[PDB]
Recover the amino acids of this structure.
């Protein structure tokens, strides 16, 4: 049940990403969160400004059909206020010719309850870039 | 915070030492038996337990035929309460290739730690970049 | 009644192929277990569970399919699996007729008297 | 649920270990004489019987991992297991390598004993 | 013998006529409904029936087929096998004249006094 | 009918036995001296006689041939055509196990009570 | 020598110019009905008769050069001419181009009139 | 006597092929007109005249040759030309059996009662 | 460690002047005889400020980020700062893109104000 | 005055380059601050701190080579600090005796610490060592 | 010798002018009808007479759609008596390509001349390098 | 003295480069000896003499460009002759607005003839004009 | 007959080349002869030193079987003391594996009788290099 | 045209000193502050003679040929010579090979002797 709560809070963050809602993303993330991701070219980025840039400049891709599947998530619980979730993300989309395609990425996300709310403190993403 | 994170840095440094020595014994002692791992060698999959990494300790990292050198760069540590932590850093690896030339590889490493029974256990790792 | 039951499975599978050919996702849903699994090229080597992954291809997709000689295994009164080669004739963007081959395994389980599709494994090229 | 799922995982592990041992007589005991197979070695064809696979048992430092198996139970005497197989090996040049294949295996419990009746593999030819 | 091989050349030339004209009906009348085929379009599989070939009749002009020196095996009065190289002259996309070579085996069986095409095997280029 | 197709499967399996053993003599005894052949080794040409195939008997081990689901056409009592996919398991240069697929048509004619191989057509990989 | 060599050069020039005109009825008049041909368009086969070549007369800014022809005279009614043919043409992009082929043509004087009975061409498919 | 004369030309040509197979350049010289000509891959698109060019290949050169169905034209009592496909089975450096195809035209002229080889045109691959 | 905050601030000002195309604020902060190694200069050592003008005049939103800077304080008049710079920009289609470069900047204190005397940049232009 | 300092910095730096060309890690460690940082191609875009990373290349790297320091610019900052920038051009002979030339751009920062000149930071771009 | 070679240079320059103008009339007047030519367009063959080059005058060099420029570089002249000469030089050609960009091509040219009936005739050319 | 001459040569040469960047062949011909010679990539390893060859490029060559003359060295030889060597670095924008840089090494020889400075020879290697 | 003399003098030069006899080559060539050839990279070389270098440094290739054929030479006569000859040269040789190969070059050679002896004054060679 | 023979001879001496590896005769003929553009220097302008030492010390028969030189006489103290240089050498297998370069050399007359003040070479190293 506690694992299912981690799945729900993590899926709420994934919803905020799919809807491009940076306010939902910002409140849901510790303002000191760090990130490894292909867009950062092997560097650890801190704060939310780096990710704000990607939220505000992907409007060319709205209305383009995409669907994201989270595959068999694995959750480590570490007390009552700490959790880590790992899963394969699969993205179905359409290329230029309209042909459906698929991309895979692996995601680790670390969650921490601060002040009674689950906070997103670290993400690690490998595989196909989100852009 | 100023010294608790030093505890996470030292523990993670002992783990990196074990990997560099090919010391699977110390590795197993520092890792939780149900730990998970994303890494290039796993071809995009999530591997559970320590049997997958045992292969690399046995057949490769137990061959000190060439001196190698790892390097942890600028560790960033998150602290989730008193029992849990997460450390993220860049790892640089110097080695000798097939022809004896010094070369360098980069990895990005996330490692998650849980203090269970008064001992830090490695519960999850995510590595990107160079396969070792 | 082994041959009767194999004919039964051939027909149940053909009805599933019909719902796919007609792009009929509702019928496809009625015939598949809600927790079915699938290996297929579109899944990039991963096992996908459920039906949400497959809807994308009913929605965003001059063709003829040839089902070669199927092989059926019966595993008790309420279980079978069928394997066959599928040859697809289609025309690409340039109007050129082309052929693609796939190999398919489908696993069927009769739950409460109704045959349910619970696992598929397709190898070859992505579906056209 | 878990009880029958674990018995299917066991018998599939036994098949996999018989394969890694190159132990064809064990494999033959675990396989129905009329089993079928889709596999890369078969070049898109469905091969029947066990003779085709004897070539690979007779002509062979590895570790095989069976990731998160999914088991469908269909009555008392039928199961389908699906899993990603990771193979850790060492090439000629000694460089360690990994390969991935996806395996569907169908098992029929006959008179008490589980028998391997159909397999579908995609990915690495091994 | 020397007279019957001409009848096989004729029935086979009528079949190639029906192909070149895109006349699936005449083609079907010359083919047994259970005829099998190896051909590049079937990707190494043996295809049975006429549904598979109907796709290329329904979706296919300056075309000329040249049957080169057929070899006929006579196996009694009710069976023949003919083997020949076929050169196809066509205009490609940009109108350039091109040629493609295929090798064809065609087996014929006389059922109720009429020759029926029971099996083909074609190597080379797809149509 | 249902009994005769087994005889064709048998004589054809004996021919493949002679091939796999490298036994040109048994192979020759099953082949009409005027048998023709389309095969990748002949580069699109029809070859007549057995001299051409003798080269591959005289210059060619862990080999296994798998005949997949043959289709037999019976055209009377003295003629048959069999078509099958053959998978060949071999060890290449570096000892690695490899497989190759070919598609084969073989026509048989019963002359004086004995089946003779009169025509073959093979597609796919060279031997 | 030179007298019969010039008559063979003339009749071969007439064939070449009938080809460049796309004039199949002239070409047909100059060719024996049972002539044979090796040519790149035939993909290594020997084609017989004139039907095969009709496709290229019916589906066609060029200049053809016949370099230093070698003529073998074999009695009164037989000659073999061999020559390099250079074709000057303009591609689609308008860029001028040249192509080379080597041609053997065999002529038989029948009842007074020279007839083209065999040709062998290698090089450029044209 | 057209068929008799074609058999005559087939035999004369076969004797020339024999001198080539045996690497017998002296016999080859006896059968070729001193001013014979040749188009062949080894000549790089040029017409070579005489026999000095061909000696190099008799001197610096597990094989079987298959002569497919020849076509003979008769051009009077002392002249013919023969055309045929030649298939060569050989083994490369790695011991692998291989096949090559050539197309050959040969022109024969009976001078003073003896058949002389006066022109050849070979297309395909260089001689192995 | 207290002068390190001062060096971070001065260099952050230079970064902002660069991200704004503010060539006059840039020149105010630079020694007139400053040197530069940079990809845009190929393998040349560039002296002065004329060469840098072209990039202020010719190059919508662009974010230049300093990652974990390292500062060397040398006495009281001299500092060296080294860091990875991450540049987020839009390509031709308006797609977010990221470039990395490694930057070394050397600073000299004159009459209470820091002046930029030498830079070395490698990686992306 | 300042011309004396520029010749002092060029001498200290050519001493460093000589210890580089020798594989003499002993004098290199002497002339370098233990907390020096480094940008270099071998570091793959990362800033490396300390001398362990460089010791690996010194120990595991052993034809006639020639390094010419081209157009050095020295920036003097007070009397306890200098920065030298130059193009290192390396002539050598590869496998086969064919002359080859490589180039790298080098920035070296020096801090006169405890009276001795110390190497606190380097930035190297262009050709790697090997 | 000092002025006779100037005669060979001028005559050869008139020939190059004719080629640049697409003036086949002047070209034919300056060339011997039995002249021979090695050149890249001839694919390694020797062409005899002027019909081969007529094709390039008609279809290409008669299209002044783009200005071009030839250049004779450092002519070297041999004199074989009073009636024969041979001139060898490098030829540079500037032109506009498919996209309108100025480009350059190099040829090496040998041209042989025979004074027949009080007029210099071009009897043989050999060109290497760029095809025009 | 000789410093006045070096600034004179730099000015005359930057005038030439300005006429180059303008496509102003008029002033170019003015500032150049009619018998000047040229090595340049467009000449394919040949020495070209005169100005016709260069006029083709001036007439048939027309985004914001920027040329910076780097580290000029002037050699003065008496008072009627000088030689200037420098690296011309060209910043420009290609198709798509992406900044690009090209480099060429240039040697220019000047002869004060009839009191006016004349361009008698150039050697250009590296990046061509187009 | 005069054309046949040009063929003989030109074949004597070709013999001197095939035998590596630079003395026969040197006396047979005007010391001011010029040459276009692939070895000169598009330049006209003058004198005989350039060609001496190739004579003296090809000993690695002696005993390697080669044969040279001159194809249908075309000769222009220009008076009693001038001539020009053009022909295709075909070279049969063996590669590393012993496999026979062929190379083609086109040759123009200009001859001039000085002091009663045919002198070689200019050569132009295109196609496969002699080295 | 009479000083042109003098320039040809002096430059021919420099060529011979180069072909002999005679670095002292070379230095005798060169201004100590001579400049050089050359492929071996990549895109750098090289000053002095230290850089040229490596090629005299490290580089059997080699023939350096001057092709149709062009000489510019400037007054009475200054000359420029430009020419294609053809270099015949042996490769690793002893096979004759040819390289081309284009060379510009600038000469200054001091006290009756010519000194080499600047060279530009393009093409082959
Ligand atoms: O993946 C995240 O945690 C948030 C994130 C951060 C970032 O720097 C760049 C991209 C993302 N997300 C995203 C993804 Cl996966 C796919 C498409 C668009 C976007 Cl906007
Ligand atoms: O084969 C199925 O069960 C359903 C399925 C799922 C899926 O993820 C991708 C494709 C399919 N079928 C399909 C096929 Cl074979 C061919 C064409 C279109 C479609 Cl829509
Ligand atoms: O997977 C099996 O059921 C048995 C099987 C059959 C077959 O035809 C080809 C290969 C296998 N197994 C195998 C594998 Cl995965 C890897 C290495 C060796 C072997 Cl022997
Ligand atoms: O060859 C036949 O018997 C009939 C046949 C069947 C088939 O599946 C594909 C093609 C064909 N014929 C054809 C050929 Cl050779 C060439 C062009 C069009 C056509 Cl329609
Ligand atoms: O296939 C046959 O009928 C006989 C035949 C003839 C021929 O020309 C070339 C090969 C074969 N058989 C063969 C095969 Cl399939 C595989 C391996 C070796 C051999 Cl020897
Ligand atoms: O060469 C001939 O005899 C006639 C011939 C026959 C043939 O099958 C193919 C082509 C040709 N001639 C041709 C040539 Cl070379 C070039 C262009 C058009 C034509 Cl139409
Ligand atoms: O075919 C001939 O007439 C003679 C001839 C000449 C020639 O230049 C090159 C090859 C050949 N014959 C040959 C052939 Cl087909 C095959 C193998 C060896 C030889 Cl030696
Ligand atoms: O980096 C500097 O100090 C100033 C400088 C000089 C120069 O020649 C080229 C670029 C820059 N700056 C810049 C950078 Cl880092 C990134 C984007 C735009 C600009 Cl405009
Ligand atoms: O260049 C330095 O300051 C020290 C240094 C560190 C390092 O990690 C790698 C190389 C070096 N030097 C070096 C150079 Cl430039 C060239 C050849 C060998 C060496 Cl050993
Ligand atoms: O560089 C010169 O002195 C004159 C010259 C001559 C020439 O043949 C080709 C180009 C140039 N100059 C040029 C340059 Cl560097 C760059 C762009 C345009 C031009 Cl037009
Ligand atoms: O061909 C000549 O005229 C003389 C000549 C000159 C030269 O610079 C280089 C080579 C050659 N001859 C040659 C030829 Cl073709 C082939 C093999 C060896 C030699 Cl040595
Ligand atoms: O060319 C010079 O002036 C001196 C010079 C300097 C230099 O840095 C490199 C090479 C050279 N000369 C040379 C040349 Cl051109 C050719 C072969 C060997 C040598 Cl050693
Ligand atoms: Na098709
Ligand atoms: Na073969």
């Amino acid at each position: 049940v506690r694992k299912q709560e981690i799945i729900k809070v993590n899926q709420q963050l994934i919803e905020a990403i799919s809807n491009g809602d940076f306010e939902s993303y910002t409140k849901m993330c510790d303002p000191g969160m760090t990130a490894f991701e292909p867009e950062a070219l092997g560097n650890l980025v801190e704060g939310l400004d780096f990710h704000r840039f990607y939220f505000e400049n992907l409007w060319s891709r709205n209305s383009k059909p995409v669907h994201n599947t989270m595959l068999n998530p694995h959750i480590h619980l570490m007390g009552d206020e700490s959790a880590c979730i790992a899963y394969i993300r699969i993205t179905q989309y359409l290329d230029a010719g309209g042909i459906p395609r698929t991309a895979q990425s692996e995601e680790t996300r670390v969650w921490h309850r601060r002040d009674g709310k689950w906070q997103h403190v670290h993400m690690h993403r490998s595989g196909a870039p989100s852009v």
About this structure: Chain H is about 25% helix and 45% strand. Residues J 20, 40, 42, 53-54, 57-58, 61, 122, 124, 129 surround 5-hydroxydiclofenac (ligand 9) (CB under 6 Å). Residues 32 and 117 of chain H are 4 Å apart (CA to CA).
